[model samples]
Target: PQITLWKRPLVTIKIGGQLKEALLDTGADDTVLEEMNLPGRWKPKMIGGIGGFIKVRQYDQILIEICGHKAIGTVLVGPTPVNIIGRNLLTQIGCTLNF
Candidate 1:
């Protein structure tokens, strides 16, 4: 399925059997979520953005559902207010360009 890109391509996704709204950020190389309490050992890491850098935990092989599409990949847990669905997952569902 192809999705048209908006200024902010926000969509509802399910992670850990919980619903969450996330930005489908093509610019971001990896997906970052707001501190989800998922089972697994995560490694502490740092990420930088427009707001600068912050500490985050990197969790691997997380099964996340995007608008009924299932995608399993890396998801970072952090203190971000919103979830960012990066290219790592975006490529799974397919992409569409628009006005």
Candidate 2:
């Protein structure tokens, strides 16, 4: 399947039995969500951003569906304003850049 990249390439996905719109970010290494209710032992981690750092709860082995594509991997729940779909989950669904 071929997809033309939108300005932000936003896509709707299912995570933790909840549907949400997330930014398809190739620049990010890990998927980050504004909120998520996951039952597991999550470690607190801090990631560097352009201006500063943000703390997040890292959950492993999460099940997410991206445009009907299924992926089981790590997801970070944090204080981000918007949900971001990063390389980890993107690679599982064979997402790559042409630009």
Candidate 3:
């Protein structure tokens, strides 16, 4: 089967008391915050990842609005190599992916 996809541009959000801009990723399973960039209030908790359970934490949900679309959901907070935009917001918004 042939698949086609379009990369959506990054949208800005306020996280950990800071304004941050991140790309909207339809394929990710959860929203992530890079450890280096996260604010001081965020903490880490242990959560399962692709390899295994990793130390992670949950932070308060932020209001994210894009192109008039909005979603308020929890995100994983802690140190990570890459910040990801994930499924929680996508499902909350009832978005259907076409490929």
Candidate 4:
């Protein structure tokens, strides 16, 4: 899919059988989502963001379907300005930037 940069690259995605909107942020190294409860054990992790470092729950091997394309990777749940699908999952889907 050819997406223009005029607006935020936000798309509907399915995670843990629930649908939510997330940004396709290439600048982010890991996928970050808003506070949500998911099955399985998660490790407490901290990551650096715009303001500063924030605490997050790191869930591994999480399955997420982005616009019908599925990819499994680590998903961080915490306080984020928005849900971001980052490089970790982006590369799994073979996404590329073309100017």
| Candidate 3: 10-residue stretch with minimal lDDT | 1-10
lDDT of 3 by residue, 52-85 (tens): 6667777656665533466787778666556666
lDDT of 1 at 55: 95
Estimated TM-score for each candidate: 0.85, 0.91, 0.60, 0.98
lDDT of 4 by residue, 1-99 (tens): 999989999999999889999999999999999999888889999999889999999999999999889999999999998999999999998899998
Candidate 2 Cα deviation (angstroms), residue 58: 0.4
Which ranges in model 2 have alpha carbons more than 4 Å from their true place? none
Candidate 2 per-residue lDDT over residues 1-99, each given as its tens digit: 677865668889998798889898888898989966888799999987666899999999988999889999999999987899999999999988786
Error of 3 at 47 (Å): 2.4
Name the best candidate (by lDDT): 4
Specify the highest-TM-score model's number.
4
Off by more than 4 A, model 4? none
lDDT of 4: 0.95
Model 2 poorest ten-residue lDDT run: 1-10
Candidate 4 or 2, higher TM-score: 4
Q: Every model's Cα RMSD, please?
A: 2.0, 1.3, 4.8, 0.6
Residue pairs with backbone overlap in model 1: none
